[PDB]
Amino acid sequence: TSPRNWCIKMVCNPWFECVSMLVILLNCVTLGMYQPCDDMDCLSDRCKILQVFDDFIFIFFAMEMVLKMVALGIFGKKCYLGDTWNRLDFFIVMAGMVEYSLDLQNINLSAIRTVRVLRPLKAINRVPSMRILVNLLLDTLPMLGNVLLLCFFVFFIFGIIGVQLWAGLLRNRCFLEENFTIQGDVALPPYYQPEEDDEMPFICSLSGDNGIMGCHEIPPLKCVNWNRYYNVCRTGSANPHKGAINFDNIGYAWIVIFQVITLEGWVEIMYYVMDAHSFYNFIYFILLIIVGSFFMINLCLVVIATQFSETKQREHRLMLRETRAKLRGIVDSKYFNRGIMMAILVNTVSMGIEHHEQPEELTNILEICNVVFTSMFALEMILKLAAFGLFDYLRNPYNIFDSIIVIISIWEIVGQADGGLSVLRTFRLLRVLKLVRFMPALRRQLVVLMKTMDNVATFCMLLMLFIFIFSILGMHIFGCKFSLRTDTGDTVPDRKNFDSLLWAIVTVFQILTQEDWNVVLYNGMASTSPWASLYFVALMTFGNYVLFNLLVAILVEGFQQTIIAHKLFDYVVLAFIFLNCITIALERPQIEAGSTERIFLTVSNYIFTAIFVGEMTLKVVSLGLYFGEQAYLRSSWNVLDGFLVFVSIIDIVVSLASAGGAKILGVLRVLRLLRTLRPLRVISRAPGLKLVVETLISSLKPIGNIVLICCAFFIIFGILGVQLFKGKFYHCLGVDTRNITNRSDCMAANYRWVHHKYNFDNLGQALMSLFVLASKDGWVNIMYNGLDAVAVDQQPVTNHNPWMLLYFISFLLIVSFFVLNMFVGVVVENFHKCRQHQEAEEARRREEKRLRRLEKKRRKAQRLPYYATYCHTRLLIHSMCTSHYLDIFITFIICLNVVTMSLEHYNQPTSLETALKYCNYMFTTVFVLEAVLKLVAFGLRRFFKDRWNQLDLAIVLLSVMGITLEEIEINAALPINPTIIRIMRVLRIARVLKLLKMATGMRALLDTVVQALPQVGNLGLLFMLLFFIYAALGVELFGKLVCNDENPCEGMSRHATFENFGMAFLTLFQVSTGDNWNGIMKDTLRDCTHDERSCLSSLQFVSPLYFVSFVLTAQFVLINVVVAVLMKHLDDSNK
Ligand SMILES: CC(C)CCC[C@@H](C)[C@H]1CC[C@H]2[C@@H]3CC=C4C[C@@H](OC(=O)CCC(=O)O)CC[C@]4(C)[C@H]3CC[C@]12C
Ligand SMILES: CC(C)CCC[C@@H](C)[C@H]1CC[C@H]2[C@@H]3CC=C4C[C@@H](OC(=O)CCC(=O)O)CC[C@]4(C)[C@H]3CC[C@]12C
Ligand SMILES: CC(C)CCC[C@@H](C)[C@H]1CC[C@H]2[C@@H]3CC=C4C[C@@H](OC(=O)CCC(=O)O)CC[C@]4(C)[C@H]3CC[C@]12C
Ligand SMILES: *[C@@H]1O[C@H](CO)[C@@H](O)[C@H](O)[C@H]1NC(C)=O
Ligand SMILES: *[C@@H]1O[C@H](CO)[C@@H](O)[C@H](O)[C@H]1NC(C)=O
Ligand SMILES: [Ca+2]
Ligand SMILES: [Ca+2]
């Protein structure tokens, strides 16, 4: 109409969307300027100007809203409320109007002002690529409810189990005696805490609750041992982490289960529970890890990738002067090119050598060699411009980059006054990048990565929008509420605060990477309210388990003589190797010299070596050592077996050479390390594992180029870190660590000059610190050291140079991009091979599948025995009482059961106890009723043929078993062990399993997982083998590492030390989960008090290599498990 026609031209004008983006970004800038610490009631200048700015922003938002209503209509498809984001704009408009009205009404109510944080989200609609991507995500969300139902199942089951086991157990601190007598000056706290303010609480074990740490393990204070008076412990206090880690409610149990889904703070709460209730809760926590933290979030990855696959496909289916020429000859010689490669490579090596406290001669050699390299590069400059001409030299921009490098180097040499030595020397690293001009594979790989980034960029903007929104939300709700209290005369703010958008964004990025996100979880749950954990739950879930899986999907679909008998010899030698494994898992560094088991271990080594040399001889006489083709050493596995048996022989020889063992103890160490390497022939002696290892290697070449590029970036950033941080990672750890600046001040105080184990002095230490950074573990402390670092021998000061956040976070982003590229390369590599196999066997498989549709035709009507029950008083039972009208009742009763179990907590009302008793009676009675109903509906044939009525009968049998024991405590018929009652209650949870019948999506998805168990099981066996090998190897390397007060541990707390074997298997699992693995490797590399050779040994060479290699192999194995699940899911999508 005419009124509509007046404004449609302006509304449809792209100038309107341009000014919409302008004001959206201006609104983002206005939201970013909030200073929660300083903007107190907005009694400041910038507060007032920002209020005016936001006022104008809301005025324009209201104006554009009314313009679009009066130009497009309301409440219709063509109308304004047609697109989703228009409704969102209306939502912010309404919320802002409400906030403005309450501002007029003089009602502060700082909770609707916390809707401003949603205003940046409007930028999604006013960007085409962003709008398409977000619409695709919103369309793939409704198909994610299945894995969200899996999430609910394996959160609720573990929440019920946790609340039923450890309801309030975490609270029992160790108190003084009940009637305590003190002469005077009562300084004893009511209970015992090792650290101040219950930072590391002392959760005991109750009398009857067979924990481990039971108040007789108290640290003897070292006068009078005041600690021994903490005798009895009772369940009344605040519970650990300022009341944040407990199992009282089911919300708190869900918080803890989430904390172990993200694999952060796993061990701390694990040992909290072990202290509280029982040592055997490791089954609970390890099962939760394996099920949730790996089989859930990676099923989330699989589901998002798949759903985005056919959601891309669905939308896609809707559409569907004479010397100049002579001087060139020297250039294109293919050997001069290699000579300049060698020059550049040795220049890189020269830049890598520099370290802290250089010898005076060494830096001179470095600068002279720099001059030589700059002279050679300038010679190439002048040569190529002459022999080619100006245009030809400038035709290729690689030569332009070379000229830039030469100019910068020359200026650096010339600029010997100031400034040049600070930046241009740091710019020397550009010469490393000249290799791209030469390596042919790293051109194609880099171009492919840029082709990917052609799709990543919009998703990067989406991620930045998301992180900005949540950083603003954090500033709003956590501003000035994270203030750590006074310890030196002032309440210094926590480093992971939310007081400024710089710190807000760094903290939100840190939370997304899952490093010390539990600390901010606790300090935001103990400051505002326990409901503040929803902030972190939403942040982590949308970021990691939705958005990052979305990016993975984006990339994946962007790409897409003597007699010989060999009947059971392999199987029997596999059994022998397993027995060898059993005796390898025993060589703990705790056996007394000459003990009974020591002799057994020696003789077992001898007999196993005899068996292996026997099979060696059998194989070689069957084949021949190297005597022609088809010999013993013509396969990789046979060569490995030969190497292992030869190592065992030479180790036995050296052991028999024990007489005069000096100077060969290192040789014994090396032979023992290879002895740990020994249990690896199971791969050779098994077909499935051998095939899987072959496939794992075949899936490593396609990502080999990306691995080389990422190692090159590690070297580049290592040299950069060496430049930036040389002697700056030294601090005076002492009583004060205050009012002191340089090391001379510390030596005046005589505290200590502590040298961090993670620092950038050498390039090897820089590379180890960079690997710790790039594993998104322990990287926050490294970053804090970087920002704090000041100079060679003075105290780092807090946030001295925040600009180094760029280094420490750009490294994380580049390594993350390369890791996602390795993951997608592995996925697409498996895709090709599995696709071929599919074609072939599935063509034959779709022949028999039409044969199976003919089988259903056959199925037909075999006079189904409904008549036998019809008119037999079951005329209603078989049909009218087995229909979906009767099973909705079962599902409703199950949901009521779920919400009843979700009500148990600590100190619950006894009235509520009896209410749950009656509800449980109701549920059990109706379950028995429906079991009888189906039993009379049909006879014993389908009773076991259904295979699900079996499940219902098992559930009702367990239920009636549980309820009967309750009556025993009413009539006091017999004293029943409370453990049996606990088992019955904790296994009442099995009534959830009946939801699996109607959740046909659960059946489909879990099945799709199930027919991946060939590959998943084989990789799991390989992964257990990796744990075995690396655990034995760690037992011998780090076994003698004593954990005590004299050696204050950081990562190996109580049962994670490498002392025994199993205590090393636990810590290898903990490293595999990436929880405080860097801490553990900090414990391993540690100069001791000369009490053992291990600290003073070559552990610096092998411990970082140990941990790095284990982390890499574990991650690769788990990635290939995920990939196998993904390809089986896509093959199921084919069928
Ligand atoms: C739906 C969830 C999973 C994602 C959406 C995130 C936010 C919309 C929610 C999740 C966490 C909630 C916060 C949890 C904690 C806080 C502090 C909490 O503490 C207070 O009572 C402060 C009272 C005051 O400041 O006067 C009040 C609710 C609030 C603001 C909540 C506001 C709304 C939040 C940020
Ligand atoms: C399947 C096999 C090839 C690998 C897995 C074997 C482990 C499950 C078993 C085999 C030997 C067992 C170890 C045998 C010896 C020890 C030392 C033992 O501690 C002590 O002897 C000191 C305390 C004391 O002496 O009473 C604790 C059990 C432990 C770690 C056992 C942990 C579990 C182990 C490693
Ligand atoms: C390639 C990325 C994925 C990981 C790189 C792993 C290794 C190549 C790095 C990590 C740990 C580094 C080692 C860490 C410790 C040292 C410091 C330095 O040893 C010293 O302290 C010298 C003084 C002395 O102890 O005598 C020699 C380099 C070295 C072996 C480093 C050599 C290079 C290592 C093995
Ligand atoms: C440190 O220096 C300050 C200077 O202001 C002084 O007041 C203080 O007594 C010194 N010592 C300690 C332990 O703080
Ligand atoms: C180190 O700090 C002290 C503080 O008393 C100062 O006097 C001195 O100049 C500083 N620098 C040195 C010792 O090189
Ligand atoms: Ca982690
Ligand atoms: Ca951590």
Residue numbers in the entry: 66 to 287, 316 to 413, 627 to 866, 1164 to 1738
Quote the original article:
The low-voltage activated T-type calcium channels regulate cellular excitability and oscillatory behavior of resting membrane potential which trigger many physiological events and have been implicated with many diseases. Here, we determine structures of the human T-type CaV3.3 channel, in the absence and presence of antihypertensive drug mibefradil, antispasmodic drug otilonium bromide and antipsychotic drug pimozide. The CaV3.3 channel consists of four repeated transmembrane domains, DI−DIV. Among them, the S1−S4 helices constitute the VSD; the S5 and S6 helices from all four domains form the ion-conducting pore; and the channel is formed in a domain-swapped fashion.
Whole-cell patch-clamp experiment confirmed that these modifications on the CaV3.3 construct resulted in similar voltage dependency of the activation and steady-state inactivation compared to full-length wild-type CaV3.3. A total of 1135 residues were built into the final model. We identified a strong density inside the selectivity filter and close to the EEDD motif. We speculated that it represents a calcium ion, consistent with the previously observations in CaV channels structures. In addition, several phospholipids intrude into the central cavity from the fenestration sites around domain interfaces. The pore-lining helices (S6s) converged in the intracellular ends to form the intracellular gate. CaV3.3 contains a long bended S6 helix from domain III, with a positive charged region protruding into the cytosol, which is critical for T-type CaV channel activation at low voltage.
